[PDB]
Amino acid sequence: APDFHDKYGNAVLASGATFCVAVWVYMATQIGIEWNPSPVGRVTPKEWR
Amino acid sequence: FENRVAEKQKLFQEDNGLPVHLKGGATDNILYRVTMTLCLGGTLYSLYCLGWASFPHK
């Protein structure tokens, strides 16, 4: 006789994965967090003196 | 002095269900109550003192 995992496992996996990816991608890119990545290959040096 | 240990053995082995710290009789109870009162009272007072010391008096 089918237990909790047989009945809900696939749903808990699918929707847990989807939720976690979505909310981490949102947090990482949409709220103004400064990650401070390398300037290398991204920043054009500008005159400072 | 005479050896009165046998009398004390009888007293402390009396089957009256008393814990050893109260088994000497009514004075144990008094001394216990003084001790615990001083300890509990003193502890409340140390908490009052921390409360006082926790704030500036400019």
Partner: protein, 144 residues
């Protein structure tokens, strides 16, 4: 069959690969037909039916090796639920960013960074491998 708390000091039943013959039978009390079955078991086993053999097995043991060793879908619940709570953690981080953290220092503005990056290059920060080594001073660009 029915196990009680106050039997902890008695030999008990277990299903374990590495202890195939437990200390007691799974079932100790026998009905009338079960008693007759234990008698029939004293004669040739060839005269036992398949059903009777299965029933002797199930008197002696609770689960077969195949039943006891079966795999489950638990992993899905475990992984999915862990991802859920890790997900929920990002909400706490979002709340924190919105309500707790103020602006970061002005030295992270894009123009400050571009200027700082030139100055790091002018000062040859990490010129052997780490930083300036990656800048082409001849072509005035990041090494491709």
């Amino acid at each position: 069959s029915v196990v009680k708390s106050e039997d902890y000091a008695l030999p008990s039943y277990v299903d374990r690969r590495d202890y195939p013959l437990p200390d007691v039978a799974h079932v100790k009390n026998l009905s009338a037909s079960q008693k007759a079955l234990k008698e029939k078991e004293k004669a040739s086993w060839s005269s036992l039916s398949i059903d009777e053999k299965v029933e002797l097995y199930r008197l002696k043991f609770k689960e077969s090796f195949a039943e006891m060793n079966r795999s489950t879908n638990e992993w899905k619940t475990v992984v999915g639920a862990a991802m859920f709570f890790i997900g929920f953690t990002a909400l706490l981080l979002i709340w924190e960013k919105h309500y707790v953290y103020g602006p970061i220092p002005h030295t992270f503005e894009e123009e400050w960074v571009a200027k700082q990056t030139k100055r790091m290059l002018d000062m040859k920060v990490a010129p052997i491998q780490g930083f300036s080594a990656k800048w082409d001073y001849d072509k005035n660009e990041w090494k491709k």
